[PDB]
């Protein structure tokens, strides 16, 4: 009998309790699970597969967890002032053509005509001077719905659009801890780790605690955060610093009480460009989480905190600030011997595409797939490690493109981004885009894509996502897709799709409830 | 207008007329299409087998109903390739030898989907029981109802044409090509020039400008498709693009083939292609109504043409002195680049492997799909050409690796040919997949599938690797370790195994014979 009998998780929070609850379901009461954890809600934003890939697996209905963590609805990230110079403002500046400096990255699907995405018909007309319309307004009904602050469901809870979630991550962690301890008999040891015991092979045998426990385990999950107390400190696995691709390394954050009555609730996360980074806005009922992500090479903590405060008119003497220094990059290997890293202990990028929670449940999914026995088959470990490195580096490259293709040159920070190098993989995608070709076509429709883990994991950033960011920032193809010059019938079919987007936006803006009204009903306010 | 105005296709057959008909639809009457094809006499119809996306990816695109084209090329139904005697020594026989465990030396590679329990494919629950000594049942019988249907020679549709299973097609490829020629010329205004090419005219940049014909007509064009076959008259001869010989991965380079009249009444019709292992290669059997195509694929380093023809003839009891044979020398491999300047190669002019997994027609329509996606203007953007070439090389090399695994993992060591296969090297990509398989992990986890991009990007999936590896006796080193923690999931999989048996039992009882469905289809 070579089975793992005990799994010890170091750390709580979202990483530790997502790991505990998921393995609690996956291992069907065959394995003892222990969490060792020493005893302000700035908001977290997510992507649409969180319910299908995580909560549905645990059998937790969406409304149940949402009501425990002041959750709200997200249809997109809205990028504000990424193309125009100046100080941080929550209000969009005006471009040369009179448009507000805003662009959306929605979760809505792009339809195709003749197997060519609607993006490419839009780009052909834009390049040929035949449309004045922005990509997001042309191609997604979601853009109209967001502009109206309408909800992605009706009051009868019928779905209207794709969406994900805003929530208090501390409340999600507390909710999952309660679930794991009360419904899955996970053992919660509330104590400080004082020593990692290892054998002659460098495998972890046990964690010593301050109170004198020696917690034996066969498999150790490092959820200890940026310090990597098992994977980095005990296992001596090097961390690969990737600040040569992304310069931001710090955040200052708070939660801001909000006049939902007067302002409604935006069904999207905002990414507000700053002089030395950007600021999130993550609406929830009664308040929005907000954090200024910055490079401490280009702003001091005090300078960033002052800029963040000025943005929202905060009184710095009645505001609780939370300050973090990030580690940006990933370990050389996520799993070494009998130590698997998950969450910040494994890897991190700034929350610019709301990938943090996704990286936790993707890692947990890959651990359950590659779950070992005590022989620690090197092929299982290697395949898990390859999946984590590919997932991470692909998202790192995608985030670098947000900065690299910004036209801003107004501050040392915005210029400094354009002196960095792109990795070969994203250079290849930019060249493909610049020739008018799609980048990573989607393989399926919405249901299959957000309802099968492998489908989204293998095609995570697709053509729609590349167009939203490249075209949003003003990077266009050199010329239209040449095939379109031969396809007058397909161009006509695409005109019907553009008209469908307009009619659907008109219809749903008229018929949907406000996000505020859907939230008041969900939370029983 | 910097558009291509004329496309000239050199060569007919499946490659030339599939290209003409597909571009006829894709280019919406904006481009003149010309096929230059010499008059030829079809060699005997040695039969072609296909994969299931041919109707959705190709005929449905042209608006041609399945039954209409099937009725024009004596088409029959294919639920799998059935591999015979790939594990046991001796002479070519159509009859399976007996393994050590008493089972016939047969295994199926069907198109049926593998269900999953707890996101783990049924293959992995079968492998766990097999390795733990809890089943003696073969993978194909345990995991696909299709195996029972094929063993009974039952059809994949009912006589009311309701679908029971996934399937593809057997047909006379010359008749399909003639059907598509008629369609292209009569419905899409493609010009058929029936003449021989005498010269390829090029400019100083190495672009083709025109093909001279024997009649003296000069066919001007802006884009040229090489469908000329193994001679590669445009891509290899005129453009001097080098061919990469891949006989360091696959040794077979020759075929001897014929068509055998068949007593369908007495024998029924098998709804599958057979792959019959030989001493120096293998022999296809491709049933159609009233006859089956058959060809012995061989290495002429291990068998002379005479030796191969004798062995092939002995297989079916043909008189080697009184039988009409087609003798072919293959080119195995691909061009360094499929598309050079304004010359795109399609079919045998582009690349070739032996028909061991029925991929030849797939390679044609995948190439045509990729050309329509990457369709150029007269600037011939090097990025469009490069991306097309990358797709062809990855498509080809992936299937080359998959075919090499059929030989590399055969346990046979009884002839110099079977031993010689094991001295060849596997490419890193297939070595990696075998390593993944050997750890008990899925390899490439998979209606939607048979969407072009979905199948093109995930062509050989976990079920395909299990069919071949487990068929040949290559097993994981151990079960998927996760299964040791999942008693509820193992129980769920028992219900799937029961469902396979119940569906096989039910459909073997209720389905018509392949023979009876064929008699109804062909009037």
From Swiss-Prot, chain B:
InterPro entries: FAD/NAD-bd_sf (IPR036188), Flavin-dep_Halogenase_NPB (IPR050816), Flavin_halogenase (IPR006905), Trp_halogen (IPR033856). It comes from the Bacteria. SUPFAM superfamilies: FAD/NAD(P)-binding domain. It is an enzyme of class 1 (oxidoreductase). The keyword Oxidoreductase applies. The reaction between FADH(2), Cl(-) and O(2) produces hypochlorous acid (HOCl), a powerful oxidant. Unlike the mechanism previously proposed for the tryptophan 7-halogenase RebH (AC Q8KHZ8), which suggests the formation of a chloramine intermediate with a conserved lysine, Phintha et al. propose that the conserved lysine likely protonates HOCl during the halogenation reaction. This is Tryptophan 6-halogenase ThaL. It comes from Streptomyces albogriseolus. The gene is thaL.
């Amino acid at each position: 009998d070579n089975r793992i009998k005990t799994v010890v998780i170091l750390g709580g929070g979202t990483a530790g309790w997502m790991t505990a609850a998921y393995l609690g379901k996956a291992l069907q009461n065959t394995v003892k699970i222990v969490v060792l954890e020493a005893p302000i809600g700035v908001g977290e934003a997510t992507i649409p597969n969180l319910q299908r890939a995580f909560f549905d697996y645990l059998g937790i209905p969406e409304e149940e967890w949402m009501r425990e963590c002041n959750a709200s609805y997200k249809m997109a990230i809205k990028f504000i002032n990424w193309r125009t110079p100046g100080e941080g403002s929550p209000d969009p500046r005006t471009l040369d053509d009179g448009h507000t400096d805003t662009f959306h990255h929605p979760f809505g699907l792009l339809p195709s005509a003749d197997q060519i995405p609607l993006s490419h018909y839009w780009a052909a007309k834009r390049l040929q001077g035949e449309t004045d319309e922005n990509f997001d307004e042309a191609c997604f009904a979601d853009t109209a719905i967001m502009n109206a602050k309408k909800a992605p469901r009706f009051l009868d809870m019928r779905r209207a659009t794709n969406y994900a979630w805003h929530f208090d991550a501390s409340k999600v962690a507390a909710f999952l801890r309660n679930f794991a301890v009360t419904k899955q008999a996970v053992e919660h040891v509330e104590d400080e780790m004082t020593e990692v015991l290892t054998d002659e092979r460098g495998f972890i045998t046990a964690l010593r605690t301050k109170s004198g426990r020696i917690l034996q385990g066969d498999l150790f999950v490092d959820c200890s955060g940026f310090r990597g107390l098992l994977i980095n400190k005990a296992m001596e696995e090097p961390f690969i610093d990737m600040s040569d691709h992304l310069l931001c390394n710090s955040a200052v954050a708070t939660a801001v009480p909000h006049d939902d009555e007067k302002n409604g609730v935006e069904p999207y996360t905002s990414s507000i460009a700053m002089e030395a980074g950007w600021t999130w806005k993550i609406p929830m009922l009664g308040r929005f989480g907000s954090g200024h992500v910055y490079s401490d090479h280009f702003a001091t903590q005090d300078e960033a905190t002052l800029a963040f405060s000025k943005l929202w008119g905060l009184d710095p003497d009645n505001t609780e600030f939370n300050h973090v220094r990030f580690r940006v990059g990933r370990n050389r290997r996520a799993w070494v011997r009998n130590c698997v890293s998950v969450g910040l202990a494994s890897c991190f990028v700034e929350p610019l595409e709301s990938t943090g929670i996704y990286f936790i449940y993707a890692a947990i999914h890959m651990l359950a797939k590659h779950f070992p026995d005590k022989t620690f088959d090197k092929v299982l470990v290697d395949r898990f490690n390859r999946e984590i490195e590919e997932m991470f580096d692909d998202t790192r490259d995608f985030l670098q493109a947000h900065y690299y293709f910004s036209p801003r040159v107004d501050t040392p920070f915005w210029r400094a981004n354009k002196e960095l190098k792109l990795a070969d993989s994203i250079k290849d995608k930019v060249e493909t885009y610049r020739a008018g070709l799609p980048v990573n076509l989607p393989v399926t429709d919405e249901g299959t894509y957000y309802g099968n883990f492998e489908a989204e994991f293998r095609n995570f950033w697709t053509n729609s996502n590349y167009y939203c960011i490249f075209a949003g920032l003003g990077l266009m193809p050199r010329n239209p897709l040449p095939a379109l010059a031969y396809k007058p019938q397909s161009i006509a079919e695409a005109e019907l799709l553009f008209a469908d987007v307009k009619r659907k936006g008109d219809t749903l803006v008229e018929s949907l409830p406000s996000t505020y009204d859907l939230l008041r009903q969900l939370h029983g306010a």
